[model samples]
Every structure is written in structure tokens, then in C-alpha cells.
Target: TRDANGTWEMESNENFEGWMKALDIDFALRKIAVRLTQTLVIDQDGDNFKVKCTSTFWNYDVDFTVGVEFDEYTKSLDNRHVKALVTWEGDVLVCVQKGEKENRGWKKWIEGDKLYLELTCGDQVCRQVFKKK
Candidate 1:
């Protein structure tokens, strides 16, 4: 469960370079992404959510409404343009990123004081766990 209402510290479930290599990098690449630890911060207003993915050198933020599709540039991570739509699958917020990659999507929810995020691109899936700060 990763759907807490505020900023949170994060833990990784995969290596950045390992998953970056697995993604095939046709759309975007993250060669320098492995250098820093990651964090997840968010602001939620009912159907609206703003999420920021933080690293040492850069940060990527996405702001959108649930059930509404929009264009988002993943400047920090994959560095691709993706049409994304987010919705609630039970208590989990699921996001489908439509770009050139078929396995691009995200899932987030909160379980107690911890937040969990699963990021997918192509066949690579990275789990990022978080805690309230």
C-alpha cells in the first residue's frame, strides 16, 4: 500500500542500471540514474494527484487526474513522452503509460505507514517502497 497523502522516503526493489538495461532503451535511457538514492513525494486532492520522483541529479513529476488521459514527459527517468491515464483498482492507483513500450504502467497504494510503488517499462518492473516522513 503506497497511497499516503504526503512526502515519503523510498527503498528500491531493483537496481537502476539492471532494469535500465532490461528496458532496451529504445524510447529513453537512464545512464546516470543509478548514481543517487530515490524518493517519492506526492500531493493528492481527490481525483487529482501530483507525484514527484526524486534522485540526486534530477527529478520527475507528473500531475494528472484519475480516469483522464494526458501527455507526460518523463524527464528524469526514461525521458520519454507517454500518454498516461490513472484510475483506482480497488484501493490501488494504477497508471497505464502508453508509449512505445507495452509493459509501461505504475501501481501505488498505502499499507499502514508504508507506501509501495511498482514501476514497469517493457518487461522490466521495479518495486519502490516508501515511508511517511
Candidate 2:
């Protein structure tokens, strides 16, 4: 394993606004989200994992086991509930969110001391990089 357990601070973000738009997010929230620097806390024990995304304005937490489908409510972000499943693609952690929005999902991978994330909704993709804390 590449040590996916850590607190990660945002290094850079790109196209997050476009992804929010694809998810039908409110303009007010999008504005705040785009400017916010997100921190991720990840913990993994075997196939079970917990992920927390935090920022100045909002926070979201998810707990799931790999290869198991679970109900996910995106809460403060878009307030949508979806069936989410996470799996490992080699060293990368990948998730698929099946719901009203098509092509919605995210991926995470670690390289060196940095973590990389890619979020997708419809045709838009948001890429973010984070440094281990």
C-alpha cells in the first residue's frame, strides 16, 4: 500500500467550479467552495475506510468498505443521495456515484508525499493536489 492514511492539505485545485455547476450546485455555494482550501483526513483499516473532507465553510464524512456499495448523502455540498461504491484500481482508490447525475465519481491516489484527487460530474472534471501533513 502507498500509505493512504494521513491528513492532507490542499496544494492546488482546478475546474472545481465546473464540476459543481454540473451537479447543479447553487452559485453562492460554488463561489465559496472555489475559494476554499480543502483538507482531507483519510483512515484505512483493511478494506474499511473513512474519509473526511473539511474546509472553512463545510465538511463531509464518509465511511465505507471497499467493494461494498453504500448509501451516500453528499450533505452540505449538493445535498444529494447516491449509491456509492469504492474499489481499488491498482494503487488508486476509485469511486462511482450512481444517481441522477451521470458520470459522477472521484478517484484518489498518492505519489511521493502528495495526494491527487480527480472528481467528475457529467463532462466536467475537477483535479486537486494535496500535500501530506
Candidate 3:
């Protein structure tokens, strides 16, 4: 399992554009995002986590504690408001996003030296994999 610290470089993404479409994200933004290389930075101290995702085209930053619900505004991604709660299920970190849309959440898991990100919106879920940077 990979430790939830330091930066990770994106290896690949699957179903990302579909997930973005389910969120009704703007087409122009999707066009730019679908191909951009992304990097993820996570600082985890116990259950407190601050994560940032950056790319040439966009950036997103979020901070939350496990089991503690926090209000989140996904600015550049989808421009939505949500209450996000994070929790751990075994070695996997799960997030539930309650908002105007249904079926929204994400999960993070580590396998060997890789970190996996699974993001859901509406009925579609996108999977992204990262390796040590």
C-alpha cells in the first residue's frame, strides 16, 4: 500500500470524460481536461487530510478530516456545492458527497506502489491511477 503523503503523478484515467459529462460540466472545460496530465498531493496526519490536484489547465484543493463533514465548493471542476464526509474502510479511503446531484462520491485505494482514485457523479464513475512522483 502506498502511504497517503507526498505527490503522485497520474499514470492514466478511465471514464473521466464520462463522469464529467454526467456532472454536466461545460464542454469547453471537458475538452481541456480530458487530455491534461494531472498530479495529486496529499498531506495526511492521522485523519486530517489536505489534498490538491493540479494540471496545466486546472487545479483543485480540498481539506477535510475523517468522519467530519465539511462544506465544499468544487470551483473549476463542476461549480457545485456539497457536504463531503471522508472515512476509512480498511486500507481504502471513501468519500461521500451529498449535494444537489445524486450518486456522488469517490474512493481512494493503494495497491503496491500505485494509488487509485475512483470518482462518481450521477451514474458514471471515473477511475484514475497514480504512481509515486
Candidate 4:
């Protein structure tokens, strides 16, 4: 059977502030991010998918296929463009970005009724937890 694909909502509890700071986002933007609710809509078509991260302040969208290299432009996050690749490692979806910053990207995993994500840039890492809705 094929894997079930659906849009999943995301929320950050404690790491929102720190993650924004690490990304070099300004005070106003960070303030908005912490207070605003964000949604992550993931659309899958076979082995390819597009992920959209939307918020009241900013929205980011990217499309990629498993094991294929793609260009990622983090306009709202860092205003930088990077080469990225997404693949599944075990049960977790991992993204590796190669660019000016080292060890940058994110990982997504599901645990029981919860969805977890770890966003990384340079040496800073922040975790976010989400519940299936």
C-alpha cells in the first residue's frame, strides 16, 4: 500500500523565540513569530512533495523529490539560497543543505500521536513539537 499523505499543522511552544534569534531575525519579526500561529501543509505526489510553511508574517514554500538535489531559497528565514536534498533516514525525513552555513537543514519525525521537528542552522538547533489535527 502507498503511504498516506496529508497536510499537518505545526506549532512551536518554547523554541520559537530561540529559533528566530538563531536565524538572525529581528526583534519585530521574532515577536510576530512567537505570537503568531504557523501551519505546515505538505502535499505528496508519489515520491515527490511540496512543503509550505505559512504564517501571518511570512510564508515559505519549497518542492523536492526524494534523493534529488534542489535549490532552496529561504527568503523569510534568512534571505539566502542553498542547495538541498531530502531523503528518508529510517522513519525520519531528513534534509541536508549545502551552502554558506554548515550543518543547516531540518528533520521531521512522527512519534505516536505527535509530530516532531528539529531545525538547524550553523551550530544552533531548535526543536518544535506538533500534534496531528
Q: Model 4 Cα displacement at 79 (Å)?
A: 0.8
Which should have the higher lDDT, number 2 or number 4?
2
* Preferred candidate (lDDT higher): 1 or 3: 3
Q: Each candidate's lDDT (Cα)?
A: 0.76, 0.90, 0.89, 0.77
lDDT of 2 by residue, 1-133 (tens): 4568889999899898899899999999888888877889999898989899998868889999999999999887789999999999999999999999999999988897899999999999999999989
| Residues 1-133 of candidate 1: C-alpha lDDT, one tens digit per residue | 4345787886556654555665554333364566567777889888888888787767778899999999988765567788999989888989998988888888887888788788787667777788888
Residue pairs whose backbone atoms clash in candidate 2: none
TM-score of each: 0.84, 0.95, 0.94, 0.86
Which candidate comes out best when scored by lDDT?
2
Q: What order do you get sorting by lDDT, best first?
A: 2, 3, 4, 1
Model 4 alpha-carbon drift over 4 Å, by segment: 1-4
Residue 73, model 2: lDDT of: 92
Quote model 4's TM-score.
0.86
CA lDDT for candidate 4? 0.77
* C-alpha lDDT of residue 95 in model 1: 94
The Cα error of candidate 4 at residue 27, in Å, is 2.5
**Pairs in steric clash, model 1:** 1-109, 1-110, 1-111, 2-109, 2-110, 2-115, 2-116, 3-109, 3-110
Q: Is candidate 1 or candidate 4 better by lDDT?
A: 4
Model 1 spans with C-alpha error above 4 angstroms: 1-3, 22-32
